[PDB]
Design an enzyme around this catalytic site. Structure first.
Site, mmCIF file in Angstrom:
data_model
loop_
_atom_site.group_PDB
_atom_site.id
_atom_site.type_symbol
_atom_site.label_atom_id
_atom_site.label_comp_id
_atom_site.label_asym_id
_atom_site.label_seq_id
_atom_site.Cartn_x
_atom_site.Cartn_y
_atom_site.Cartn_z
ATOM 1 N N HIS A 113 20.429 26.059 20.293
ATOM 2 C CA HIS A 113 20.672 24.787 19.615
ATOM 3 C C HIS A 113 21.215 24.971 18.196
ATOM 4 C CE1 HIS A 113 16.557 24.984 17.688
ATOM 5 N NE2 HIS A 113 17.134 24.220 16.779
ATOM 6 N N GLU A 151 19.539 39.391 2.957
ATOM 7 C CA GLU A 151 19.258 38.262 2.080
ATOM 8 C C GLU A 151 17.795 38.051 1.716
ATOM 9 O OE1 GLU A 151 21.155 36.452 0.524
ATOM 10 O OE2 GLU A 151 22.875 35.589 1.555
ATOM 11 N N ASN A 183 17.025 35.692 -1.705
ATOM 12 C CA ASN A 183 17.356 34.388 -2.284
ATOM 13 C C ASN A 183 18.752 34.040 -1.766
ATOM 14 O OD1 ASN A 183 18.436 32.307 -4.010
ATOM 15 N ND2 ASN A 183 16.789 32.788 -5.467
ATOM 16 N N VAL A 206 21.548 33.252 -4.623
ATOM 17 C CA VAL A 206 21.835 34.201 -5.697
ATOM 18 C C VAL A 206 22.309 35.519 -5.112
ATOM 19 C CG1 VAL A 206 20.880 35.543 -7.604
ATOM 20 C CG2 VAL A 206 20.055 33.225 -7.172
ATOM 21 N N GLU A 247 23.350 42.156 0.044
ATOM 22 C CA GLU A 247 23.900 41.321 1.102
ATOM 23 C C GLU A 247 25.095 41.912 1.829
ATOM 24 O OE1 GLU A 247 23.736 40.407 -2.112
ATOM 25 O OE2 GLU A 247 22.564 38.581 -2.309
ATOM 26 N N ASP A 257 16.450 28.167 25.186
ATOM 27 C CA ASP A 257 17.036 28.039 23.854
ATOM 28 C C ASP A 257 17.247 29.411 23.231
ATOM 29 O OD1 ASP A 257 18.014 26.954 21.524
ATOM 30 O OD2 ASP A 257 16.074 26.220 20.798
ATOM 31 N N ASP A 289 3.032 26.007 9.935
ATOM 32 C CA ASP A 289 3.965 25.898 11.053
ATOM 33 C C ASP A 289 5.384 26.202 10.577
ATOM 34 O OD1 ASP A 289 4.722 23.080 13.320
ATOM 35 O OD2 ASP A 289 5.054 25.233 13.535
ATOM 36 N N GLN A 308 12.098 22.543 10.182
ATOM 37 C CA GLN A 308 13.554 22.411 10.182
ATOM 38 C C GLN A 308 14.190 23.463 9.274
ATOM 39 O OE1 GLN A 308 12.638 18.537 8.560
ATOM 40 N NE2 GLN A 308 13.872 17.557 10.167
ATOM 41 N N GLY A 309 15.194 24.164 9.787
ATOM 42 C CA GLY A 309 15.848 25.189 8.994
ATOM 43 C C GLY A 309 15.373 26.581 9.370
ATOM 44 N N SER A 352 14.744 27.294 12.560
ATOM 45 C CA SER A 352 15.241 27.494 13.918
ATOM 46 C C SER A 352 16.113 28.727 14.079
ATOM 47 C CB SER A 352 16.028 26.265 14.384
ATOM 48 O OG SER A 352 15.180 25.136 14.490
ATOM 49 N N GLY A 353 15.933 29.407 15.207
ATOM 50 C CA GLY A 353 16.705 30.599 15.507
ATOM 51 C C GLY A 353 16.062 31.856 14.958
HETATM 52 CA CA LIG Z 1 21.391 36.472 -1.848
#
Ligand SMILES: [Ca+2]
Length: 223
Positions: free
Chosen positions: A40, A52, A54, A57, A62, A84, A171, A174-175, A177-178
């Site tokens: 999804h 990653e 932050n 920033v 990265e 899913d 828990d 949102q965000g 996910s995956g």
């Molecule tokens: Ca960063």
């Protein structure tokens, strides 16, 4: 993640952020060229961000790599979120180091009571909105299917499992996910869905990765 704690920079080296102009989902690095996430979370033009902490920033560890191919599970059902799961192949291999590492796939399914680590950059409020810039962590136990289905308004299949707390307060949200659910050093789950976040009687629902190992292996070997 609601009710969690700050993981610490690069302490979850297999965690990736999916970016389409902004962070929208998490994922897990399973080898130098492949990432596993939720079906999804599919979107065209996905960029995978590794190393990653932050996400707003540039900290120096990265690696930004665009997806060359995305493969949503053949039986994904957007109505029930059954199956899913999705695989993403990177255009170029990631450089593995102490801050960017892959997570192993399960050889067997985990049992109720087992402690797992869930992580992500999702909403941290059960009521309202507050998105963190740094990675959040949460330790949660796998729950029995009965506790899972008790107050659910939606179908919970054999390809899903619940993890979390029945009294609420902690828990994924949102965000997230995956993102990964790691237990005993293995990727056992993928953050999938839930009714609200950290609500009483309604723990989070996760894609049961142990049911997909065959498909994952066969697909990556052929693509
Ligand atoms: Ca960063």
């Amino acid at each position: 993640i609601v009710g969690g704690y700050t993981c610490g920079a690069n302490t979850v080296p297999y965690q990736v952020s999916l970016n389409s102009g902004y962070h929208f989902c998490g994922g897990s690095l399973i080898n130098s060229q492949w990432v596993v996430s939720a079906a999804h979370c599919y979107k065209s033009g996905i960029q995978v961000r590794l190393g990653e902490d932050n996400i707003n920033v540039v900290e120096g560890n990265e690696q930004f790599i665009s997806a060359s191919k995305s493969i949503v599970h053949p039986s994904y059902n957007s109505e029930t979120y059954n199956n899913d799961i999705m695989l993403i192949k990177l255009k170029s291999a990631a450089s593995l180091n102490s801050r960017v590492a892959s997570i192993s796939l399960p050889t067997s399914c985990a049992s109720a009571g087992t402690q797992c680590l869930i992580s992500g950059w999702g909403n941290t409020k059960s009521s309202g909105t507050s998105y963190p810039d740094v990675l959040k962590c949460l330790k949660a136990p796998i729950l029995s299917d009965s506790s899972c289905k008790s107050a659910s308004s939606f179908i919970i299949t054999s390809n899903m499992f619940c993890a979390g707390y029945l009294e609420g307060g902690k828990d994924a949200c949102q965000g997230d996910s995956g993102g990964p659910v790691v237990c005993s050093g293995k990727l056992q789950g993928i953050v999938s869905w839930g009714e609200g976040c950290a609500q009483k009687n309604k723990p989070g629902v996760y894609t049961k990765v142990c049911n997909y190992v065959s498909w994952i292996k066969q697909t990556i070997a052929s693509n």
